[PDB]
Every structure is written in structure tokens, then in C-alpha cells.
Amino acid sequence: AKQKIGFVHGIDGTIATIAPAASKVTVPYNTVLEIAVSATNIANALVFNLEKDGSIGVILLDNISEVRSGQDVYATGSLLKIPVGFHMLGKIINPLGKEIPTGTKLGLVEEMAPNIVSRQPVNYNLLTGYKVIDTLIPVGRGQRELILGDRQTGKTSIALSTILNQTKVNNEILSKNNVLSVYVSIGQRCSNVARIHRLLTEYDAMKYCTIVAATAADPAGLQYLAPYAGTTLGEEFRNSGRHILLVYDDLSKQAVSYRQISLLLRRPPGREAYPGDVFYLHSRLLERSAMMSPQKGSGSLTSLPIVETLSNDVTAYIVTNVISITDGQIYLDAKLFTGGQRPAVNIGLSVSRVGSSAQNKAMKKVGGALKMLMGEYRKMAGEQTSGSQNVSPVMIRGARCLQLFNQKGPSYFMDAIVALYAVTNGYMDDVKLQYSKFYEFLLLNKDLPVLYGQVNNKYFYMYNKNLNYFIRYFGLNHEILEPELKKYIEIHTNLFLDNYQSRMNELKSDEDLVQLKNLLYACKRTV
């Protein structure tokens, strides 16, 4: 039998006030209630305030338009829960667990985080697919790295590219080391979610992905509980020893919803109008990210929260609150996005508090070289190049590396280490900057030595795509891969400089020059 507790006294949009029944019945805190909007339908809710006179300040989450004053209120006595399991992969879902169409087990929404003994340090990587994030800003599993930036700077695209990158590996390796994914769209437009679902279905990244959508039309309480629902889906994949990835879209919107809920419930404001305990919110959310101990299955979930930024300020309340929480940050600057380069990461302001321990053996050495090269290049790059032949090697290699950092989509590990190796070792020093990516395209998709007959290497060729798992284990700085790597890259550079570079510089016609220009931009995009 359902137990009643009172009647809907008032209703102010997304919130409500419950007045107690004639009985003295008490309700718990943070538990879910039901409102009999009709004989059949029910409107779920959640407790947010209790008061001296027995009144209950309540958040509404479903069928708000059907709520009135005087409707009876039943109490379940339980915290908010949602369905969880592998059956939810490949679905867009309301944070209440209701599936959204297109064209048994239950998990608590607010759980405590793993304690200090129940989480191992970071040891494994999460290949975002972008060379910067894998080299100089190494993201790891169990890490919680923020994505900052102004509007329209690549914040969502980075996470989407990460999810798309993981799919090719997850189709190969076992189902325990594969990393699944959740995309929580807080406060976003419904069209963006449809486009994301279409993209993931095109690239077939939806088998290993789910979406938790709380759009702007949706109630604020749903936008408030969406990321907790995503983490709740990640709970099982932690505790089932699997891996999972969280992508919380704009948490500033998740905080606007909390501000709305609080201020309408006559909670006192605070700095920038927020209640004050908005830091504890993101703390509870993000401290659930962890790399779990072997006692708990060696599971993990990465978090890639996204935060909008106004005029490139990191002084706002929420941004500071989140930077204090997250390990690293991936700062996206409009001046560089608008300045031509994409993704617009700013290495001076983007960091990672895991470092070498996240990235891999093969990438550790390359990142140790690239960090030094970029620290030396930052000091010189402000100079307009005047010693055009007297330029230092560092000014060359850094510019070539910045060219290689230009992407649109993700990149395979094998398709990145070799490209960065050629830069740090100077093999790509004779070619000019504009051709830095066409070189890479031929280095990864048009094997020149295999074409021009210069095949002395026994095995090392960039067509197999399975050498990655030998580089990933042994490393290129090894007795067997280093010389073959050199006796591949040097012939590639020689054949390039002879046949393609020479033909390129001979162009004078505007038509052929524009044809070549569009080709170089296309190589920047696809690679």
C-alpha cells in the first residue's frame, strides 16, 4: 500500500511545497516522492528542504504541467535510483531512466566516492586521439581533466573525438579493457543531441556509448541530476571491473539549474547568486572519478567535464571551483581557434597533474622531448623569423609540431608517434612548414618506399595498423624498431623531397596553386 504524507500546498514552476497531512508522518531527506496528478500517471519528485512546520520543499522532475495544488503526495522512503546495466548501452535516456525515441537492477544517484584505500593511482592512458592531449597533456584513466574555453572552441568536439577514437581499439581488445562512454548533455539543445547520436551511429561508436540528455525545455531538477545519473551508470562499470568515460557537457548550466532550484525554494544566495554549496556539488560529482584498486576490479572512469568561459576569464566562481577539483585542464583559446589552429589548446594554460604515468612507454620518451622543445620554442616563437637560414633547429621542429597538432578528428597511436618522432629527430626539417601535413599523410596512408620500390625494411611499414601493439609494449627506442624506423623515415623524406617537394615549388599558376592549397587544408583536416 502506498503511504501518503501530505498535499501539494503550492507550486512555483519546477519546484513545489508540500503541506503535511493531518497525521504526524515524517519524510526523509533527499528521498523521492510521488504526486498523484491523475488516477493513472504519477509525477516523481525529490526532497530538498524540510522545515519546522512539517512543510517539504520539493524538486519536480516529471509531469510538472499536470501538478496542481491539493494533489496527494505519496512517499517511497528511498533515494532516487535509476536502471543500470549493459542493456543501456546504445540508448539516449532521461536521467530518470526513461528512454527517448529517435527516427531489474537499480543504482542510487547520490553515492559516496571510493575511499583513499579503494583506488589505485593512474597507470593507463585514454587516447583522446589528439596529439597534444596524448603528448603534453596526458589524460589517464581514473583522471578528471577539465575542458575549458569560450563558446564555439572545440570543447564538445574533443570529447566526441575521444569517444570515436576508442571504438577501433575496443573492437579489437577484450571487453574488459575497452572504455565505454557516457555523454551527459546538460541544458543543451535537442538538435545537438540528435546530431551527436547520428555521428556516433555513423562511426559505430554507439555500441559503447550512452547519452543522458536534460535539454533546456526539460526541468531544472533534471538538468541538476543528469551528471549524477551518468556517474551512476558508471558505478556499475567501475564495480564490474570495466572502464567507462564521462563527458559532462556544460556544468555551468548544471549550476544554473541548482541556483534556480535553490533560490525558488527560498534558499539564500551567495557569490554570483549561487547558494554557496555549489562547490560541494561538483565535488561530489567529480570525486567519484577514480582508478579503482585491484580489490575492487581495477576498474576506472575518466571524467571530461566541460565548462564555458566568458571572455577567456578563469576568475568566475564556477571555473575556479572546478579547476580546484579537476586534476588538469584543457584550455581552449578563441584567439588561437580564431587564429587558425584547431584544436585551439593553449599549452601555457593547459596542464595535466598525472604526466608520464598516464601516457605510455612509447609516448613517454616523445613527450619528454616535446616538452623541452616547446619550452625552448615558446621563448623564441615571438620573434619574426629573420635568420631564415640561420634559424635554430628548435624554431623549425616546434613549428612542424604545431602543424602536426592541427587536426579535425582523432589519430591512431601508431599514426601519431611516428609523425612526432620525425619532428623531434629533425627528419622533417628540409620540407617547408605548409607541407608538414601532406608529408604526414603520405607517411601514414601512401607508403612511398613500398611504391617506389625502396623496400629494405623487413617489417616496419605504416600500412598494417597492428604494429601499434608492438610499439605500445617495446617502444620505438628499442633495438629492433629504432633502425627500421629510421630506414623508413629517411627514405620517405628523401622520396618526398625529390618527387613531391620539387614539383610543389615549381607551381606558379593560380589554379594549380589553389588546388594545392585546398589539398593541404584537406590533409590538415583528415589527419
Binding site: 571491473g241 576490479g297 608492438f470 589539398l519
Partner: protein, 170 residues
């Protein structure tokens, strides 16, 4: 009947692993072995070298990853990733049996170039391969040489003399 094992937090750890190895050997699709490793870890029984080797055995001898087919399956990638999980993550090191399984897959698949990398990595670590598999690797190499399949066909064709975004295929 062995040295007590310990976690990074100094806690006592179980070694009774045979009951889980039997669950691996009874498997028919080599994704179940991964879940067996997980359920082993949850009980404070971390995998040992014998367990990883049995998982590689079940990988090599199984037909498919799961009951249904999957696109992008690679019998060798899962093995080599288990090797990475052994060396880097868990600290255990492989042995001749592990690399032998890894080489048997490359022999079956016919990928004769990765087989030479496996051979070089064996003897660089002191491991001695079986000459049966080396001879099979060189035989597949000779077949691919004489038949013209030493490399794929799409590499051995002229590139566009004229630069064009459509010609190069991008």
C-alpha cells in the same frame, strides 16, 4: 604452498587461482575469459602468469570474440594488450609460452612481418622461439613474395601526378 602476495596497500592477497583457470579453459568465446579475470580480481585474487597464459590459449584456440560476430576483431591485438596489461599495469612479466601463443596467431593469420618482430623481441629478451613457427613464417613470406602479395595492391600503384583533393582520396 607459495609466497604470500600483497597489494600496493600492503594487504594480504589470495593465490588460489586454479578454480578460475578452469573457468577460462571451459570457455568457448574469448571474451568470457576477460570477465573471468574481472570476477577473479573482485575476489582479491589477482591474475598470475598462468592465468594470463591460459587466457592467451583460449584466445588463440577460440573462433570468435563473442557468440555473434564483431567488426574489427583482431586475434593478435587482444593478446598483445594482455601482454601490456601484464608488464606495465600488473608488473608480471611474460615467458616463452606467452610469446609462443602470440607467434602462433601471427603464423595462422599469415602476417609474416609482425612475426619477425615477435621473433626479434623473443631473442632480445633471451626467449628462444620454436623453429617450426619461424619456418612457417618464412614460408608465408616466400609465398607472399612470389605471389605478389608481399604488400597490398593499393600501395603498388602510381600516385596522382596532379594534386587534387579528390585524386588522393581525402
Amino acid at each position: 604452498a607459495g609466497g604470500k602476495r600483497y597489494d600496493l596497500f600492503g594487504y594480504e592477497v589470495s593465490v588460489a587461482t586454479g578454480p578460475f583457470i578452469e573457468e577460462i579453459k571451459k570457455a568457448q568465446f574469448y571474451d568470457d575469459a576477460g570477465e573471468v579475470i574481472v570476477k577473479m580480481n573482485l575476489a582479491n585474487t589477482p591474475p598470475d602468469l598462468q592465468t594470463y597464459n591460459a587466457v592467451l590459449e583460449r584466445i588463440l584456440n577460440c573462433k570468435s570474440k563473442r557468440s555473434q560476430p564483431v567488426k574489427g576483431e583482431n586475434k593478435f591485438a587482444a593478446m598483445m594488450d594482455i601482454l601490456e596489461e601484464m608488464d606495465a599495469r600488473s608488473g608480471i612479466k611474460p615467458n616463452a609460452e606467452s610469446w609462443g601463443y602470440v607467434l602462433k596467431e601471427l603464423v595462422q593469420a599469415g602476417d609474416f612481418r609482425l612475426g619477425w618482430v615477435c621473433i626479434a623481441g623473443m631473442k632480445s629478451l633471451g626467449i628462444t622461439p620454436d623453429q617450426a613457427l619461424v619456418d612457417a613464417n618464412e614460408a608465408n613470406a616466400a609465398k607472399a613474395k612470389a605471389a605478389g602479395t608481399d604488400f597490398p595492391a593499393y600501395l603498388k600503384k602510381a600516385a596522382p601526378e596532379s594534386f587534387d583533393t579528390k585524386a588522393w582520396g581525402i
